Amino acid sequence: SLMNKSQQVQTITLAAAQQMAAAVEKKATEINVAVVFSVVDRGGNTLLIQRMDEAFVSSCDISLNKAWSACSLKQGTHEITSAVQPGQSLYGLQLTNQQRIIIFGGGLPVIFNEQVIGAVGVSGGTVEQDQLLAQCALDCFSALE
Amino acid sequence: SLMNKSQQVQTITLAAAQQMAAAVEKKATEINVAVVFSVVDRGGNTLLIQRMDEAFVSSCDISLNKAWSACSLKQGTHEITSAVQPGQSLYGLQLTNQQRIIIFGGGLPVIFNEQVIGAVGVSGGTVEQDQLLAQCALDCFSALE
Amino acid sequence: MNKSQQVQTITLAAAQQMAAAVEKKATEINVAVVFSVVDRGGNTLLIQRMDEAFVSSCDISLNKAWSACSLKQGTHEITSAVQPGQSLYGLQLTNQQRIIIFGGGLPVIFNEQVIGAVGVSGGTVEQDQLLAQCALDCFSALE
Amino acid sequence: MNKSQQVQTITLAAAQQMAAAVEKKATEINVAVVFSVVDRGGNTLLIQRMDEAFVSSCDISLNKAWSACSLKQGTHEITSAVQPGQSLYGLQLTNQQRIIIFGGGLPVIFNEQVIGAVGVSGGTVEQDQLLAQCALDCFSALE
Amino acid sequence: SLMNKSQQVQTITLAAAQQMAAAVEKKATEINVAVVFSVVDRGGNTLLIQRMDEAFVSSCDISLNKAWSACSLKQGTHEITSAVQPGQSLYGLQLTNQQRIIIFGGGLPVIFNEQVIGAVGVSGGTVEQDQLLAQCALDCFSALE
Amino acid sequence: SLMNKSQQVQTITLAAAQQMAAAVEKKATEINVAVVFSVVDRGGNTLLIQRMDEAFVSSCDISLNKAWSACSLKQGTHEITSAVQPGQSLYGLQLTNQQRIIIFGGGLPVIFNEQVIGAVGVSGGTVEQDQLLAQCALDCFSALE
Amino acid sequence: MNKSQQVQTITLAAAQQMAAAVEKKATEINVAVVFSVVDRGGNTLLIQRMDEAFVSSCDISLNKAWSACSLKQGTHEITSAVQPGQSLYGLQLTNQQRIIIFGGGLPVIFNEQVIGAVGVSGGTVEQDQLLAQCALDCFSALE
Amino acid sequence: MNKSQQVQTITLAAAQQMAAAVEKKATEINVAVVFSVVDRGGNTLLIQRMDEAFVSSCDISLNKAWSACSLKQGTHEITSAVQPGQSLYGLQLTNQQRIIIFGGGLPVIFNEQVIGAVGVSGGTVEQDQLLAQCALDCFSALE
């Protein structure tokens, strides 16, 4: 055959990041919560981090790493929780990668054209809230343009 | 809707922290334990760390990071202990933020005007003792004017 | 005695205004940058990277903002202090190297306080600085 | 609004070829090196260390690749800018000391995009930069 | 008793590691997973890291540190999993050594002459899959001469 | 009263460290095990680290930190194991101090004149062995001079 | 054989006095500083940060104390040795960048033993070293 | 092909001989030092501090030994390579700053191999180096 020497991939943009920030900020407001929102591009690289003024300062690292975890492992941070419990197959996964791997909900990959173009991360509510606001961002994304 | 380019907040003062340290060093003597005692401002930055001679040296870093957690999480460090055991919804949190979120008792926020203005951390006793002494610091603070 | 000081901090709303402003100048002067704002106590409010800004510019942008808030001054005003043979040689090595020692970070002075700071990284130093200043200029004509 | 740009990244297969060109060419010049290729986000594809290479050159080589990618230019380019007295003195300390300021790191520039990068360490800076250009020349000769 | 100022040991060679990587990349394809594959020498220093395009990027650091653990512990990384669960005699070990001791399967030592000469690490599949592939690397090595 | 402005304390020496190294090395040999041995002085500061040639390279950090843990917390590393289990008071202690706190046996404080003058640490056997060789060092110490 | 030496360490009580002498003297000269005292092993006794001090000076101040203790001499002493071209160029990078090379850190020398140390940061290096000597003078006036 | 290289490593027994030797000279030239040995692959065999050696000398001593093993050369032979303006300026910042760039670390060459290394820190550079060499000299008249 011919070798593929380079491949074509889609990355999410700041434009799109910026818009999902506003969705999240508007949804978080009416469920009466202050969160950090993060979006990473397709390589896991920080595009946006945005912290509501009443949100936990502890939640900026968390929110970023949920995005990076969601993009890197290609799934929600909620989907790895069961695998990392004492006694489960991937127990100790949470200790790798300088502890960047987040293992509770709040981080989602962004899927465009059967492909992971980036990810989002929300922190500073309950875990159920984080994840609801994370899907909320995705639902904004898919609507755009 | 007129929009706010700034926010007026309140922070605890070094001289408040110094009074707090007097009261802890006293009460630690009366119950016969040596501890390390820490105060952080509104942004979790250090105001005051004090180690009694006989307090473990491993308690320096813990005392400070108890103060930091209770600030950033705006709750007592004992309050999160339940949430982060295996199987629970925030298991893994103790590994975030370069392991500065301490998950056992002895950190408490200074609440003034319904608002987190600062925090204290006591390390070196039992968990029960650390939490008692740290309460003692807040009892003092609300007795100053 | 006083058990608490009143102080002032920049908001997310402010930082968002300033970001749109910085993205707008950066586009016209043909340069892709990272823009970061921190609050009063030096903590992260808003970080943004344009799609073409160097991925190593994320780290620096935030740290510029942090240093300008920390040191109550612009990160360009320290560059000379720190050279070999000079009194604060080595200050770049403290604080997990989070002290940035070239221009592009600037405080938000408001009300004769330091209420937070901005940091810009991406293009030349002077481009960063100009784009940083247009962030502040924006801030002043918010009400 | 554009919610996603198309971009382009080097493959593992391409990095394996560059590695085999560098490996031969290092030995013909009588040096042992470490070769590292990063993709578009500067994420690792490959690290390959010759037996007699310095184990110190592993992290150096990877960070040469990451640097070149993220800065979009050669680690050899930034060397004059970071010298004491210059404008970017203190860049070297940023990003957890990953920004390597001496020659050896080169971006892979296919379609006017940095699509990734390579880094060689283990020799002189001159030999390092020779080997890395020698890998880029492997790539642009591939199909 | 004459005393030894040096010791003759054996180490695995880069060209051995390159053959091993060929065989893993092959067998990963045939079972349909993308992984990252790592080899370390007699002292746990890196010989070869290889990430297939689609393998998680969080597996780079894991693959390498599996190779490192199985070298330094002179056993399979699956072999310590039992010992380090809560309540067990080496709980806490996973936190040592800057979190480089990986406590789930996929690291295996190259034993030659009854002697640890090197190690391999596979990360990116299930734990079962990683351990299969890493075995595959050793099967290959002992078939070379 | 008069303030004590400085206090008098005893520190262990290299001399003594060196001698307990030989005891340990001789005992480890006849129970057929290769270990790392460490001794810290009274401030927790490294006096000696000594690695048998067949011992796990993973065991140098461990062995040092067992000593530093034994000196810092003023007790054996075996005595904190029960306190740090999930659900126990000091759960998460193992995450503090850059993870230097070791929580399985093998580290002992050295007690001279009702005072902790330093500590020892052994690693690279079973935990029971480490601790047996650690007491073995103490038993050598008390015999000296 | 001697299995244990007697040594000697500063107390918390003594560090509290030095802290209160520095705190007054900083304000009389119109600067805000961070004061830190380490014991004989360079283990922390005290960190006390004036409200208007740079939060960057916390880690600087502690590491001034630790440095002085461990090196047994003033951080001001080693400054000439670590300059580029000199014999100890690259000391500054050792020990996780804890070895601070500019003035502010002084050992407490009671009975010809370093028994611990102090560090001040927040001013000029000149003011820093003034304040720290000013703390040693508090100690040697105590009983 | 070859699937494995035979190599040679220093033993604990050797390192113990050399330590007694280094402690013996250090005592006569009136200086307290830390002495460290690493093995073939650069890993810790023996570290020893004399009761008066600066506590910051532990870190450096080991790292000297590590660099001399890593770079297959003495840590004094690199000092000139790394100055500002010179080709390996910055090499002191790689490898978590474990590259020591002043004298006092030296390899154990045995049998035209590098079989490990020593490192000495504590006194002047030249004292460290001399004491380092007397470690090697010791090693050569072991049998």
Residue with tokens 């390996």: H88
Question: Distance (Å, rounded) from C-alpha A18 to C-alpha A22?
Answer: 7
Tell me, yes or no, whether chains E and H touch by having 3 or more C-beta pairs under 8 A: yes
The answer, for G8 touching chain F at a CB cutoff of 8 Å, is yes
**Is the minimum CB–CB distance between F100 and chain G shorter than 8 Å?**
no
Q: Residue F74, exposed/middle/buried by CB under 10 A (0-12, 13-18, 19+)?
A: middle
- Rounded Cα distance between C55 and D74, Å, is 15
Q: Which residues are CB-neighbours of E109 under 8 A, at least 6 positions away?
A: E70, E71, E74, E75, E76, E116, E118, E119
For residues B125 and B102, give the distance between their C-alpha atoms in angstroms, rounded to a whole number.
15
How far G12 CA sits from the closest chain B CA (Å)?
Answer: 6
User: Quick one: closest CA in H to E44, which residue?
Assistant: H41
| G63, two tokens | 């590491």
CA torsion, points G114, G118, G124, G126, in degrees to nearest 10?
-40
Q: What is the DSSP string of H40-105?
A: TTS-EEEEEE-TTS-TTHHHHHHHHHHHHHHTTS-TTTTTTTTSTTSTTTTTTTHHHHT---SSSE
* Class of residue B143 by CB neighbours under 10 A (exposed 0-12, middle 13-18, buried 19+): exposed
CB-based contact G97 H97, cutoff 8 Å: yes
Q: Residues of F with CB below 8 A from B85's CB? A: 86-87, 91
DSSP 8-class letter at D105: E
Chain D residue closest in CA terms to E36? D45
* Closest-CA distance of chain E to residue D88, Å: 31
CA distance linking residue G100 with residue F141, whole number of Å = 37
Partners for C (CB, 8 Å, 3+ pairs)? A, B, D, G
Neighbouring subunits of H (3+ Cβ pairs under 8 A): D, E, F, G
Q: Which of G55, G82, G93, G96 to mutate to test the interface with C (most CBs of C within 10 A)?
A: G55
Compute the distance between CA of residue B140 and CA of residue B143 in angstroms, rounded to an integer. 5
Instruction: Provide CB contacts within 8 A for B113, sequence distance 6+.
Output: B10
CB F42 within 8 A of CB H51: no
Residue A126 is given by DSSP the state -
* CATH code for the domain of A28: 3.30.450.150
Angle between helices E127-141 and E14-31 in degrees, nearest 10: 140
Q: How far, in Å, CA of G70 to CA of G117, rounded? A: 9
Resolution (A): 2.2
Does B46 contact G49 at a Cβ distance shorter than 8 Å? yes
CB B99 within 8 A of CB B69: no
Task: For tokens 């003011």, name the residue.
Answer: G127
* Torsion sign (Cα): E13, E16, E22, E23: negative
Do E90 and F62 make contact, defined as CB atoms within 8 angstroms? no
The total of structural domains in chain D comes to 1
Contact at CB, C91 and G102, closer than 8 angstroms: yes
C-alpha B108/C-alpha B101 separation (Å) is 13
d(CA B91, CA B101): 12
The Cα of A90 is separated from the nearest Cα of chain C by a number of Å equal to 31
> Is the CB of D102 inside 8 Å of chain H's CB atoms?
yes
Contact B91 A99 (CB under 8 A): no
Nearest residue on chain A to B44, alpha-carbon basis: A57
**Nearest alpha carbon to residue B77 among A86, F103, A58:** A58
Question: What is chain E's alpha carbon radius of gyration, rounded to the nearest angstrom?
Answer: 15
- Which DSSP helix (H) or strand (E) runs through F109? strand F107-111
The two structure tokens encoding residue E81: 């999993």
**Residue tagged 């020692």 (tokens):** C101
Q: What angle do CA F47, F53, F56 make, to 5 degrees?
A: 85
**Is the CA virtual torsion E83, E85, E90, E96 positive or negative?**
positive
Residues G64, G98 contacting (CB under 8 angstroms): no
Neighbours of C109 (CB within 10 A): 15
With tokens 């060196």, the residue in question is F18
H 41-60: CB under 8 A from F: 43-51, 55, 58
Distance (Å, whole) CA B53 – CA G10? 9
The minimum CA-CA distance between G102 and chain C, rounded to whole Å, is: 7
Burial of C83 (0-12, 13-18, 19+ CB in 10 A): middle
Whether chain B has a CB inside 8 Å of the CB on G95: the answer is no
E56 φ, ψ (degrees, to nearest 5): -45, 140
Element (H, E) at F138: helix F127-143
The whole-angstrom distance between C51's CA and the closest CA on chain A is 6
Touching status, chains F and G (3+ beta-carbon pairs under 8 Å) = yes
Of D11, D47, D50, the CB nearest to E49: D47
Task: Give, as one character, the DSSP assignment of residue B107.
Answer: E
Are 3 or more Cβ–Cβ pairs between E and A shorter than 8 Å?
yes
> Which of D27, D38, D40 has its CA nearest to residue D61?
D38
Q: What stretches of chain C adopt beta strand conformation (E)?
A: 4-10, 34-38, 44-49, 105-110, 113-121
Nearest to F94 among E71, E72, E92 (CB): E92
Quote the DSSP letter at residue D97: G
Q: Which one of D91, D94, D96, D101 makes the best mutation probe of the C interface by having the most chain C beta carbons within 10 Å?
A: D94
Q: Do F57 and E72 touch (CB under 8 A)?
A: yes
Chain E residues with beta carbon closer than 8 angstroms to that of H8: 6-9
Place of tokens 């006017």: D112
Touch between H and A (at least 3 CB pairs under 8 Å): no
Contacts of A141 in chain D (CB under 8 A): 3
The rounded distance, in Å, linking the Cα atoms of A111 and D141 is: 35
Q: How was this structure determined?
A: X-ray
C-alpha Rg value of chain F to the nearest Å: 15
Q: Which domain holds residue C60?
A: 1-143
Distances (CA, A) of D44 to A65, E102, G3, H55: 18, 20, 52, 38
Q: At what angle do helices C125-140 and C12-28 cross, to 10 degrees?
A: 130
Residue in H67, H87, H95 closest to D102 by CB: H87
Question: Rounded to an integer, what distance in angstroms lies between the CA atom of residue F106 and that of residue D108?
Answer: 52
Among C57, C62, C44, residue whose Cα is nearest residue C119 = C62
At G9 the three-state DSSP class reads: strand
Of A90, A11, A19, A80, the closest CA to residue A46 belongs to A11
Which residues in A lie closer than 8 A to residue E94 (C-beta atoms)? Answer: 92, 95
- Phi, psi torsion values for F54, nearest 5 degrees: -95, -5
DSSP 8-state symbol, C46: E
* Binary contact (D58, E46; C-beta < 8 A): yes
DSSP string, E87-124: TSTTTTGGGSGGGT---SS-EEEEEETTEEEEEEEEES
CB atoms within 10 A of CB D124: 14
Question: Touching E: which chains, 3+ CB pairs < 8 A?
Answer: A, D, F, H
Distance CA B76, CA B80 (A): 7
What's the rounded Cα separation, in Å, for the pair D125 and D105?
Answer: 10
HSE, side-chain direction, 13 A CA sphere, residue F46: 27
Q: Which of E85, E86, E144 is nearest to E110 (CA)?
A: E144
Kindly list the residues from chain D whose CB atom is less than 8 angstroms away from the CB atom of residue C101.
89-90
Contact G4 F43 (CB under 8 A): no
User: Contact F90/B102, CB-based, under 8 Å?
Assistant: no
Q: Compare all CA atoms of chain G with the CA of C93 and give the residue at the minimum distance.
A: G97
Angle at F115 between CA F112 and CA F117, to 5 degrees: 70
Q: Give the CA radius of gyration of chain G.
A: 15
Yes or no, beta carbons of B127 and F95 under 8 Å apart: no
Q: Of C38, C11, C12, which is closest to residue C117 (Cα–Cα)?
A: C38
Name which of B58, B94, B126 is nearest F97 (Cβ-Cβ): B58
Q: How near does any CA of chain D get to the CA of E89, in Å?
A: 34
Chain B hits for C9, Cβ within 8 Å: 6-7, 9
Max CA pair span of chain E:
57
Is-contact C79 C28, C-beta < 8 A? Answer: no
Tokens representing residue C32 in the block: 């892709």
- Beta carbons of H43 and F60 less than 8 Å apart: yes
Lookup result for tokens 């030096």:
C42
Q: E22 with E52: CB under 8 angstroms?
A: no
Query: Which residue blocks in G4-124 are alpha helix, DSSP H?
Result: 12-28, 57-71, 75-82
Place of tokens 């079972």: E31
